[PDB]
């Protein structure tokens, strides 16, 4: 029948996973063995556990959920960083750690990979801090309930969870997994609440014709993107996206006005939000970065707060209401409120050089924007890449992935890898700076391994420019690499296996243009285009936003 | 006057740090500034936070202590893995994380780099699990006492500690640090307990002729290496080192019989240990690895447990006794108990069976590699030996007095060796620094070699390319033991970036025969302005006989079925 | 041969304990048996775990340290309240819990007294939050090191520690304990640091004639009481005690100017502290209560901060300096700075119903050099504070933790540790009701504790902070409770006495009865009015209310 391992494998398959990512270790080899018995899933290996985790995170952006398997302690602790990331970004990533032989608890035993103490619950306890659920499986009999609990929890809450599994029980017999349908079983919206929430919104915007819709970075987590479009079309008001919510709303929609992000919003959008009589925020995340150093806070007395599972409106809080239902209902009964849109229309709100000239930041953004199609996904790394990506016009169906809540530089590399494994057919573009690329560069080797065509724009401006614009110092300088040259190293052509990765250098617009052509044709492996630009040549947005962030960060203690 | 930052800076200088490692982030930028104000220390930057943590770890092996600075959450959480490592390896690494503005607590503020909630004590709480002390600093006034405490704790317990500093107080005035001596102030040995412990050992060994001394991996942490030599000479007994304690005892010493590691011990050693009437364990760590899958466990009745700060002997436990003091006094009082050594030599077991120089034009084999590397070992040489077959190759090498081996056998995080070798090289410029690392492990942390290139460190790197995780193949083999091959040699010019924004003098070389290996080695030694990577090609099955035997044991112990409880 | 249990027992005797407190459970029965084998120590039993813990805490005030033994979970968690208390009050109380059979870990076993889950580390983890050290012992071999470790930590840091022991290993063999001296083995003051700290203090006060000395509540933890008196006499300056430090300095010493507590200080004191050029603070704890709602904060420009193990003076911090040494060597080198004390000097019905002032007056009259007054949270804080102590008399305050009801178990534990002393307990009705059952143990062991139960019908201290129906209680015949605890005419025996006092005469008469009752405790139920409290309480209470309700500040 089933084992602890094959039970887990079946559950992962049942949730939609076609892959899981792993780094082998003696505490998880038998588990990995068991996972391999499943004929509906592949096992994908990574260089290290940080990357293994971010790879699952990128996979979950593509598939909805993901799984990573590491070894006890030496494997798990670094992965925890990625799991914290998955919590911050609302992605159900399942981390499974190998664990000690069950006989080793309360035994006076010191084990390898651990602290040198005799107890082994510290990993589990750390994990509880950064997950929606965390369970330790010490016996075969308890496996089914714990796996089911953590999986159901991850799916309902759109958050990562933790499982550890004693290495000697991986092949032990246990109960069979029931229907996949049970795993997705959530509660329906409380009818009385949904109705009142809608009625209060209609009452709220009855004498407020200037209605704006603020799209938030939790919109996808709530699976209410489609619903948001219906409402917007019915409302006929202006729709703005928060920076992190880019591509969560169709930009070719006639109601879309661009990015809201304080002083660095799209032209006119900032004024449009302050003129709005009502702001209906759809699954928003308000933090020090999205508010631009706290300079852009929404007015509470005109804000409708439509979170993924609750709605606050007209001074009443309505829990137990799914955003998708809320939006669908409101769409059907809402009247036209086009005031904010008309206003924006009435508003009245870099300079290119030739391809035979030193490459500049604005020329890169342009050529990348020209590559965008409804089948494209852009992975935007923390750095100026955030701002360049944000300024691009997205054809309906084009996606952009941001990690603006966690903001772990280096994320974009293994994430692009994981995402590509999950969406091989898409045009996958990775926009990443040299600074970030160095933390996790090696995962590009796995793109080479799996023959994943990923187009990598490596922005070599020789250091951490985004930090240069927040607060400069010697700590913003790095060792430059021959980034284009790394690809052949990863190919290893000359050793054993093989690789069709390509590394190109771009020092002018013409070169970048040719390099891009080569990248598009290279569908056999990734293509890294090393773009050379100046440290100071960044978006104007970064410079302004950076000053706000720096001011926010350093503001003096307030007497308590 | 002082600031939170410069106070920390001063304390670090005071404990003997000449560098501290860092990865910048807005939560630590002002802190880095303040640290830079103190010119008695250099600020060394790392690619990522895991390496930054292991780089400090390596530095602590070279200098006794170290410090890494990271940014909140995204920086600290991965660094925790290395910090956990410093705990398991008994190294006082000080992890300082930048932290949220102090006004953002109990404010309903969601901040970047965090979980998306409005509280920020989770990192502190996680860190308490892997440190001997962890303190958050939220105001300037509290900074002095917390800094002093963690640092004092680090030094005394020989464990890593944790500090976090609100980003807006780094540059705020605080009281000035006092005398440096106050940081090293530790209790002395309780005189009565020291004397009783020595007396009870004398009584215990009075009629136990065959006395063996087993050197443990916590010996250097206790600072008792020199005293151990004194005691060993006065005892005249057999001295064996546990696997993890290689280089912790002089191998040229006439009392040294080699490695005690169960069925994979040096010839005659396994028999000698079981024949001994008394085993004096010096700062040991008995775990599932050092015991060869629990097959080699010391006899509790014949065991004298001389720990760093306590001795259990003749059925009595004596806390508050420094190992250094214990061994120093025992040395003065002990009589010659040569029984065990006599037995060892009479075994006539000979010495480790080593291969002769291979035909230089013959395909390269594991044994040839180990031979040529061993010939590079000298008094001022240090070999960093990565988890993998490198453990066993390194274990087999004969060390001239002064030669050091660095193992991470408790934590065992593959890839540790690369950042560690960097940190160690920064702290030990006057040694020949060698790194023996497998292809599999190298891939976790390879980018830190670029920092070696950056700081022009002449590290010699033997990259063992056997196309995968051999050590795991010898425990339990599966597809998960294969990796994507790299042109490791070629990686060196990438890190140089010659023709780019800067430069580098690293060299990458390939060796497929003994002859090539020898030539590559000559080149390595001649390259003085940067690290040299020698890519050694050998077969996956071409590994030590020791690994195969050890791997079988480990596998069986890991997989043994649950016991009815 | 020793066992895990007998190893702990011997360590406890070695640190000076003559008693340990316990409440039996199936998780600790065998452990308790092993502890009983040592005849240098009595096992003392309690009504419940909170009181058992607070009993240990009170014992630690008299003996220097103590131990409490409880059963897993149901026993440990409530005791955690009293351990947290021991941490706040800087007392080395060792809490030992019974624990599951070591076979029940990682076995999928659900066990009684637990949460219904199959894991059993939650108690240990909760413990780490409120202790200086926490160790779970699962095998006999690991016992000596963990036992030695927590006990040494307790003695060093003057904080509580935690131990749990698998129920099935208590009587199993382990190494024998070495010499007791190892337990108190602590570091010495760094010489360079001690010498430097003294010199900066001399330099700091060289030109500042008006030196005041502020005595803090951690003075006893630092064991610097005797050294403080040497310093004071050598200095000749003004000496004052913060509220929680009452009796940590001889009130008959000519340098003593009384209590420093902001607008509720002794007459002249608040002004002299402001007039003083330099304030030498000996191990102070500055909190919202000791600062009178943050209204009375020391000026950091004139402040010398001498903590138990560090001194901050003239903007320099000196760690690894024992306060005892600092004061001793400072006393040997300091010259007269009398300005502060000089300044202070020239600044300044028997049958009718009973009032608070009368109770206070008669209690004060009972104070002797052999007396210890346990003062409960309530108006009792302020009544005790206002009393003049003969040199030698002691006052016990739980002013950091402030758990009402603390006083009954603490008084019991304190009396067990110091039977020779005249043990007085000042407790209000409200507080008494949380822990009143431990008076049965005073009876049981024939401890002549004199209890002044202040029956003002409700929580008056809370009345004077912020009033509401929640400050009202159900009244008891408190006096009558004594005969209930005696159980005379039932199973065992009891010599407790309960009396009612509604007038001064009735109070004085019950006090004589209390004095003549040497075979058991004496509860004197004093009837006063809810509003009939100290003026200090009304002032302090106001400042405390204001601090607590301060509006959130911005950003
Ligand atoms: C794991 C980790 N470590 C450090 C950082 C800090 N950090 C940044 C922030 C935004 O998180 C920040 O400063 O707060 S941004 C940043 C530099 C990114 O440099 P790149 O070269 O990739 O970007 P640009 O030069 O801006 O194109 C660093 C190191 C980080 N974000 N994540
Ligand atoms: C961070 C991390 N991840 C995974 C491992 C598991 N792990 C190992 C052990 C020691 O833990 C083991 O399984 O025994 S060994 C190992 C592979 C090492 O392969 P190398 O190519 O460097 O060694 P050789 O092939 O033996 O020369 C891995 C991945 C590990 N030790 N650390
Ligand atoms: C276990 C516990 N529960 C509640 C309290 C709160 N609490 C007090 C304070 C001072 O701690 C406070 O209000 O902050 S004081 C107090 C009532 C004390 O009433 P008593 O009747 O004993 O004192 P008086 O009426 O002043 O004689 C309570 C319940 C407390 N201190 N401890
Ligand atoms: Mg850059
Ligand atoms: Mg290998
Ligand atoms: Mg009352």
From Swiss-Prot, chain C:
GO molecular function: magnesium ion binding; pyruvate decarboxylase activity; thiamine pyrophosphate binding
Keyword entries, A-Z: Decarboxylase, Lyase, Magnesium, Metal-binding, Thiamine pyrophosphate
Keyword Amino-acid biosynthesis applies: no
Gene that produces this protein: pdc
Cofactor binding comment, as recorded: Binds 1 Mg(2+) per subunit.
EC number: 4.1.1.1
Biological process, per Gene Ontology: aromatic amino acid family catabolic process to alcohol via Ehrlich pathway
Note: Rapid and exclusive production of ethanol as the end product of sugar fermentation by the bacterium Zymononas mobilis is due to the presence of pyruvate decarboxylase.
Co-factor(s): Mg(2+); thiamine diphosphate
Subunit structure comment from the entry: Homotetramer.
Catalyzed reactions per annotation: a 2-oxocarboxylate + H(+) = an aldehyde + CO2
Name used for this protein in its record: Pyruvate decarboxylase
SUPFAM superfamilies named in the record: DHS-like NAD/FAD-binding domain, Thiamin diphosphate-binding fold (THDP-binding)
GO cellular component assignments: cytosol
Residues bound to Mg(2+): 429, 456, 458
Residues involved in substrate binding: 26, 113, 462
PROSITE patterns listed in its UniProt record: TPP_ENZYMES
Region: Thiamine pyrophosphate binding, residue numbers: 379-461
Alphabetical list of PANTHER family matching this protein: PYRUVATE DECARBOXYLASE, PYRUVATE DECARBOXYLASE C186.09-RELATED
Pfam families named in the record: TPP_enzyme_C, TPP_enzyme_M, TPP_enzyme_N
Coiled-coil segments: none
Family: Belongs to the TPP enzyme family.
Residues involved in thiamine diphosphate binding: 49
């Amino acid at each position: 029948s089933y084992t602890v391992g094959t039970y887990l494998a079946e559950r992962l398959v049942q949730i939609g996973l076609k892959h899981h990512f792993a780094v082998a270790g003696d505490y998880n080899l038998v588990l990995l063995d068991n996972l391999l018995l499943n004929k509906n899933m592949e096992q994908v290996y990574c260089c290290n556990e940080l990357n293994c985790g971010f790879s699952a995170e990128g996979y979950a952006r593509a598939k909805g959920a993901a799984a990573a398997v590491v070894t006890y302690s030496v494997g798990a602790l670094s992965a925890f960083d990625a799991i914290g990331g998955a919590y911050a970004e609302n992605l159900p990533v399942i981390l499974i750690s190998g664990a000690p032989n069950n006989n080793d608890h309360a035994a006076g035993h010191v084990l390898h990979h651990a602290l040198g103490k005799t107890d082994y619950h510290y990993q589990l306890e750390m994990a509880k801090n950064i997950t929606a659920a965390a369970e330790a499986i010490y016996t075969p009999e308890e496996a089914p309930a714990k796996i089911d609990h953590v999986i159901k929890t991850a799916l309902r809450e759109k958050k990562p969870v933790y499982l550890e599994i004693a290495c000697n029980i991986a092949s032990m017999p246990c109960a069979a997994p029931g229907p996949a349908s049970a795993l997705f079983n959530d509660e329906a919206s409380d009818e009385a609440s949904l109705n009142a929430a809608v009625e209060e919104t209609l009452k709220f915007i009855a004498n407020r014709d200037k209605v704006a819709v603020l799209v938030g970075s939790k919109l996808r987590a709530a699976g209410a993107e489609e619903a948001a479009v219906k409402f917007a079309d019915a409302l006929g008001g202006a729709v703005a996206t928060m920076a992190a919510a880019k591509s969560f709303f169709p930009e070719e929609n006639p109601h879309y006005i661009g990015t809201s992000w304080g002083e660095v919003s799209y032209p006119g959008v900032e004024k449009t939000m302050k003129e709005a009589d009502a702001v209906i925020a759809l699954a928003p995340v308000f933090n020090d970065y999205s508010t631009t150093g706290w300079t852009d806070i929404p007015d509470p007395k005109k804000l409708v707060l439509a979170e993924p599972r609750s709605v606050v409106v007209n001074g009443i809080r309505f829990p137990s209401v799914h955003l998708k239902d809320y939006l669908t209902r409101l769409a059907q009964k809402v009247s036209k409120k086009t005031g904010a849109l008309d206003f924006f229309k009435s508003l009245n709100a870099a300079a290119p050089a030739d391809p035979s000239a030193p490459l500049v930041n604005a020329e890169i953004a342009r050529q990348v924007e020209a590559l965008l199609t409804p089948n494209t996904t852009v992975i935007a790394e923390t750095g100026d890449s955030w701002f360049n990506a944000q300024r691009m016009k997205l054809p309906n169906g084009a996606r952009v992935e941001y990690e603006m809540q966690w903001g772990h530089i280096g994320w974009s590399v293994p994430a692009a890898f994981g995402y590509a494994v999950g969406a091989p057919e898409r045009r996958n573009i990775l926009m990443v700076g040299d600074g970030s690329f160095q933390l996790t560069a090696q995962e590009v080797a796995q793109m080479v391994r799996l023959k994943l065509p990923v187009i990598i724009f490596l922005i070599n401006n020789y250091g951490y420019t985004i930090d240069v614009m927040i607060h400069d110092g010697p700590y913003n300088n790095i060792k430059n690499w021959d980034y284009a040259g790394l690809m052949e190293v990863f190919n290893g052509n000359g050793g054993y296996d093989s690789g069709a990765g390509k590394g190109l250098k771009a020092k002018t617009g013409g070169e970048l243009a040719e390099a891009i052509k080569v990248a598009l044709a290279n569908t056999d492996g990734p293509t890294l285009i090393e773009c050379f630009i100046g440290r100071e040549d960044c978006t104007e947005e970064l410079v302004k936003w950076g000053k706000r962030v720096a001011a926010a960060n350093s503001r003096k203690p307030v007497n308590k």
